[PDB]
Amino acid sequence: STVESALTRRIMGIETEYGLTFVDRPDEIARRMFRPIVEKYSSSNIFIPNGSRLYLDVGSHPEYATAECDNLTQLINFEKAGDVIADRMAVDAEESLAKEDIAGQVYLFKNNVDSVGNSYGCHENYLVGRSMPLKALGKRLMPFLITRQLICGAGRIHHPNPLDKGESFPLGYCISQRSDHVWEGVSSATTRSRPIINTRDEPHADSHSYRRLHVIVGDANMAEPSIALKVGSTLLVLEMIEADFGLPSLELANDIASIREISRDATGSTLLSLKDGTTMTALQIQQVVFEHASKWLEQRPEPEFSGTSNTEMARVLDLWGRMLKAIESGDFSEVDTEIDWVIKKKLIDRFIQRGNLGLDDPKLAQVDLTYHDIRPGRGLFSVLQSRGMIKRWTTDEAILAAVDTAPDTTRAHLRGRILKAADTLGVPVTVDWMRHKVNRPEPQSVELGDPFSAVNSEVDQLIEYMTVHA
Amino acid sequence: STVESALTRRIMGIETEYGLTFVDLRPDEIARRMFRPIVEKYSSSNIFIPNGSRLYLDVGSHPEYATAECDNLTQLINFEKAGDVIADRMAVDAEESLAKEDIAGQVYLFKNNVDSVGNSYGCHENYLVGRSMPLKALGKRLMPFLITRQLICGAGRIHHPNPLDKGESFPLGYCISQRSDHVWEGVSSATTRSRPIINTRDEPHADSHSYRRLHVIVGDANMAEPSIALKVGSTLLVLEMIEADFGLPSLELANDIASIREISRDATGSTLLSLKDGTTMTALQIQQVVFEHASKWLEQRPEPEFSGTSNTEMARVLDLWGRMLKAIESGDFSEVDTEIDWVIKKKLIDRFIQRGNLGLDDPKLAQVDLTYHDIRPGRGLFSVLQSRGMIKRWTTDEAILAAVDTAPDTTRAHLRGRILKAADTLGVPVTVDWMRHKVNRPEPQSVELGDPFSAVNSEVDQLIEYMTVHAE
Numbered sequence: 001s002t003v004e005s006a007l008t009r010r011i012m013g014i015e016t017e018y019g020l021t022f023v024d025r026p027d028e029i030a031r032r033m034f035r036p037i038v039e040k041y042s043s044s045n046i047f048i049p050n051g052s053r054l055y056l057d058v059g060s061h062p063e064y065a066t067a068e069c070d071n072l073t074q075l076i077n078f079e080k081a082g083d084v085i086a087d088r089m090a091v092d093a094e095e096s097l098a099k100e101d102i103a104g105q106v107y108l109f110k111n112n113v114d115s116v117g118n119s120y121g122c123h124e125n126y127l128v129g130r131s132m133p134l135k136a137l138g139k140r141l142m143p144f145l146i147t148r149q150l151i152c153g154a155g156r157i158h159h160p161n162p163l164d165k166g167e168s169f170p171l172g173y174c175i176s177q178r179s180d181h182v183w184e185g186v187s188s189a190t191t192r193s194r195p196i197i198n199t200r201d202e203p204h205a206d207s208h209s210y211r212r213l214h215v216i217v218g219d220a221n222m223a224e225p226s227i228a229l230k231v232g233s234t235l236l237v238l239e240m241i242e243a244d245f246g247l248p249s250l251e252l253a254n255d256i257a258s259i260r261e262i263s264r265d266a267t268g269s270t271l272l273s274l275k276d277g278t279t280m281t282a283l284q285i286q287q288v289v290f291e292h293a294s295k296w297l298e299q300r301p302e303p304e305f306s307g308t309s310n311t312e313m314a315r316v317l318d319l320w321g322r323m324l325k326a327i328e329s330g331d332f333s334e335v336d337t338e339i340d341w342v343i344k345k346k347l348i349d350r351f352i353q354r355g356n357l358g359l360d361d362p363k364l365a366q367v368d369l370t371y372h373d374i375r376p377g378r379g380l381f382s383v384l385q386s387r388g389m390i391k392r393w394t395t396d397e398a399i400l401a402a403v404d405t406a407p408d409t410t411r412a413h414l415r416g417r418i419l420k421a422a423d424t425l426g427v428p429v430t431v432d433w434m435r436h437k438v439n440r441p442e443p444q445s446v447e448l449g450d451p452f453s454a455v456n457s458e459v460d461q462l463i464e465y466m467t468v469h470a
Numbered sequence: 471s472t473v474e475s476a477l478t479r480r481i482m483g484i485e486t487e488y489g490l491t492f493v494d495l496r497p498d499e500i501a502r503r504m505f506r507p508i509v510e511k512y513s514s515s516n517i518f519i520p521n522g523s524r525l526y527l528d529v530g531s532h533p534e535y536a537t538a539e540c541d542n543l544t545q546l547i548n549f550e551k552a553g554d555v556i557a558d559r560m561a562v563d564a565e566e567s568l569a570k571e572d573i574a575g576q577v578y579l580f581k582n583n584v585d586s587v588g589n590s591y592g593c594h595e596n597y598l599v600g601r602s603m604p605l606k607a608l609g610k611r612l613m614p615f616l617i618t619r620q621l622i623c624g625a626g627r628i629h630h631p632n633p634l635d636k637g638e639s640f641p642l643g644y645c646i647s648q649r650s651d652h653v654w655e656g657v658s659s660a661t662t663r664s665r666p667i668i669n670t671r672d673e674p675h676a677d678s679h680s681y682r683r684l685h686v687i688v689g690d691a692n693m694a695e696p697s698i699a700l701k702v703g704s705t706l707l708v709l710e711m712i713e714a715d716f717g718l719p720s721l722e723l724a725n726d727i728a729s730i731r732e733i734s735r736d737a738t739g740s741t742l743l744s745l746k747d748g749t750t751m752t753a754l755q756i757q758q759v760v761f762e763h764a765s766k767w768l769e770q771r772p773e774p775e776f777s778g779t780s781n782t783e784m785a786r787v788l789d790l791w792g793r794m795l796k797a798i799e800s801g802d803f804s805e806v807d808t809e810i811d812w813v814i815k816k817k818l819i820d821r822f823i824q825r826g827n828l829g830l831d832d833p834k835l836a837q838v839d840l841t842y843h844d845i846r847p848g849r850g851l852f853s854v855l856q857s858r859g860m861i862k863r864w865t866t867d868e869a870i871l872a873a874v875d876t877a878p879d880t881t882r883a884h885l886r887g888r889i890l891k892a893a894d895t896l897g898v899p900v901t902v903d904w905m906r907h908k909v910n911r912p913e914p915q916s917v918e919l920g921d922p923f924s925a926v927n928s929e930v931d932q933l934i935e936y937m938t939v940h941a942e
């Protein structure tokens with residue numbers, strides 16, 4: 001018939017298994033043999049049975065990304081589980097070193113800046129519906145975000161850099177760790193530019209229904225009530241926008257014009273220029289959003305399934321209100337076990353008082369840093385919390401459970417089921433946020449496009465398939 | 471306004487970077503040691519390397535090397551042989567890693583299909599075919615050829631009956647094929663683990679509408695380069711004749727696996743096969759008829775415009791195919807005895823038998839049967855013989871050596887290779903797969919390569935530029 005139909009140029013490939021024997025367990029032979037290539041070429045994105053991901057690359061900061069959460073307290077549990085998991089890695093490294101002659105300490109800091117000026121992110125991801133308009137973000141969300149540091153910042157001691165060009169801020173305590181770096185990123189017209197809000201990321205969801213909103217402006221927080229207020233306040237703001245609840249447009253003429261200045265002023269009197277031509281203080285912006293959020297709660301429909309409860313939002317708003325009254329009155333005694341920058345500042349002030357120290361005293365720098373050391377009993381946050389000087393949002397029991405067990409209300413529940421079977425059956429599997437694949441014998445794939453669903457019959461078939469060939 | 475629009479249940483997640491420091495080695499060495507246990511336990515076992523290939527490394531399993539996508543016969547040989555080099559290097563480095571520890575000994579990696587304990591190891595072939603042809607109709611017309619192909623390309627083994635089995639149907643004897651018994655066992659079981667000889671239903675790793683993937687399990691792992699060429703080359707000509715509807719007769723078998731184990735034991739090729747149409751042919755006769763048509767096909771075969779396997783190479787394939795069939799018919803193998811694994815191996819085995827007045831079950835011969843497949847240069851029998859001029863070459867050491875570090879330049883593997891080379895030179899992470907390539911930082915960038923034939927892509931150039939610009 002048709003001779004031109006034969007594919008004379010065709011794609012082809014061979015897969016060959018090799019018999020591996022060692023002549024004097026053997027499992028130790030295979031492991032040492034695979035080691036060089038595994039460490040060099042394996043993917044750096046590592047998914048673990050609690051549904052979370054670790055990003056580990058020998059030239060990069062280690063990063064922990066929580067599993068998908070549908071509830072505020074649950075999110076807190078899983079973020080704290082990350083600190084436990086990362087700390088355990090450090091502890092095990094110290095021991096393997098100690099087994100060798102070499103001894104010393106491994107430190108992991110959860111903060112946003114290092115002695116050399118390097119930046120470290122703590123990023124938020126929020127699912128929103130295609131319902132919410134592009135425009136609203138700049139108008140409504142953004143002004144809240146620029147000032148949110150007043151309520152949730154982790155604090156840092158700022159030293160002027162003599163080689164810095166174009167601007168100088170004096171030696172001083174800032175409520176925010178991130179603000180100067182955020183300013184640089186936004187100001188940059190080069191590859192160095194970092195946008196504060198990004199709606200265009202791969203949604204890790206069905207693209208039609210769902211957008212993923214990625215926010216870079218927040219500090220890494222230690223105290224559980226500070227994480228709760230940071231994420232909690234933001235959740236309420238998103239709901240009000242989604243509900244068209246009447247949050248006024250606060251839109252700023254230039255988003256970063258005041259961001260560094262707000263950081264230096266704990267009275268919140270910093271003045272921002274609205275695109276209106278009008279001006280408001282950072283505190284006034286927060287008081288506006290707070291008052292509207294307080295009215296939202298009165299009409300907030302209770303979620304029928306999972307979600308964050310009205311009772312829990314009332315705890316969020318209670319702390320929110322108390323913090324604004326403290327910034328306004330200048331009296332922090334009601335908030336000073338809950339808010340990172342305040343807790344830290346209170347300790348720094350005791351040291352200054354007692355030792356008559358200056359703000360650049362190495363002793364203070366040690367407080368500012370070791371507050372962020374995640375090692376239980378060594379780190380300053382751990383000591384404070386153990387003595388009752390930092391209040392709890394959640395419990396140790398819940399954090400411990402989240403270390404090995406995935407969220408049971410979301411897609412992560414399914415990823416967790418797959419990984420646990422893989423561990424027990426001994427079968428290799430490859431997962432990501434959406435795509436889940438068994439590599440052998442035949443490559444069975446499943447795509448989980450709905451991040452809200454903890455039920456899929458395809459996943460049940462996949463797990464039985466694995467069980468069949470174990 | 472609309473209160474029910476608020477998502478009071480929404481999805482959320484946090485990503486946190488930690489600062490890492492050590493107070494008294496290189497911080498690189500500190501991170502490496504810290505990450506190791508989690509990397510080893512939880513990292514993906516599919517590992518993509520710069521030459522475009524993929525290693526499957528999992529402490530539970532047999533190490534497997536899958537070649538990069540190839541579009542030419544000789545190129546495919548180069549990349550299969552590169553795999554043995556790469557696997558051997560892993561073994562050699564493990565020997566010197568174990569030496570540091572008090573453990574001494576030799577690492578052996580065998581490229582064969584069976585071990586002394588009864589495990590099976592596969593050498594599987596993947597072929598892109600035209601999506602025009604219905605999946606099952608292709609198998610039917612491919613199968614007669616595939617079942618009998620072991621005659622021309624088998625690697626050989628000594629079969630040892632299990633005396634404890636009273637239901638053992640086969641005696642002590644030399645088989646031309648390694649895989650036949652295990653393939654027979656996998657097809658016939660009611661058990662859900664039964665696996666087919668041909669599978670079309672695999673993910674194409676190509677445009678779903680344009681191309682279909684053929685996955686074939688019946689072949690032996692081969693050492694001799696002309697054995698690989700014949701196995702794959704003959705199969706390419708058969709696929710071509712089918713796609714061109716050249717008139718290759720339908721030889722469909724009554725039962726696919728009925729004769730598979732029996733053919734393996736008979737080097738005269740006289741094993742009988744029952745056809746659907748009610749006639750019967752010997753294994754040697756099916757091969758003769760397929761070969762006769764392939765020979766006419768070559769006369770009409772249009773020279774590929776770009777790359778592919780040329781008509782000159784296919785003529786080499788047919789030269790060998792014809793000589794093998796003549797040897798099988800006459801019983802005189804003197805012309806093919808440097809080119810075909812089972813023939814090469816049997817010549818060796820027969821020599822020892824004669825020198826020693828040995829029986830076929832002598833451990834010495836079992837050692838030969840095994841060590842022919844040892845891939846270590848100078849230690850393995852195959853490598854010793856190839857040095858002597860006792861085994862003919864289809865390709866060169868230089869092409870194989872280049873294939874170790876550099877991907878095929880004619881297919882999508884070229885692009886995956888460039889990306890992974892840039893990641894190595896820039897010291898930055900990237901996650902790649904057959905189709906997908908992504909970086910997470912500073913901002914996530916992803917590219918999908920759906921076309922396995924294309925070696926040129928703008929998104930790839932830019933991805934590599936993005937990696938370069940943002941690299942430390």
Ligand SMILES: Nc1ncnc2c1ncn2[C@@H]1O[C@H](COP(=O)(O)OP(=O)(O)O)[C@@H](O)[C@H]1O
Pocket residue numbers: 011012013014015439443516524536537538539540596597598672674675676683684904922
């Ligand atoms: N489009 C294609 N057509 C034919 N073979 C392919 C194609 N893409 C990749 N291959 C080959 O298939 C083998 C990989 O097997 P596959 O099942 O696709 O992935 P994995 O085996 O890693 O799960 C490799 O040898 C590769 O060269």
Ligand SMILES: Nc1ncnc2c1ncn2[C@@H]1O[C@H](COP(=O)(O)OP(=O)(O)O)[C@@H](O)[C@H]1O
Pocket residue numbers: 065066067068069125126127201202203204205210212213433451481482483484485910914
């Ligand atoms: N549908 C979703 N909505 C919101 N957040 C999600 C969703 N899916 C995953 N995430 C979160 O995104 C974070 C990881 O994303 P990442 O792999 O960094 O993607 P990218 O590199 O594209 O930003 C995790 O915290 C995870 O829980």
Ligand SMILES: [Mg+2]
Pocket residue numbers: 015
């Ligand atoms: Mg495979």
Ligand SMILES: [Mg+2]
Pocket residue numbers: 485910
């Ligand atoms: Mg990320």
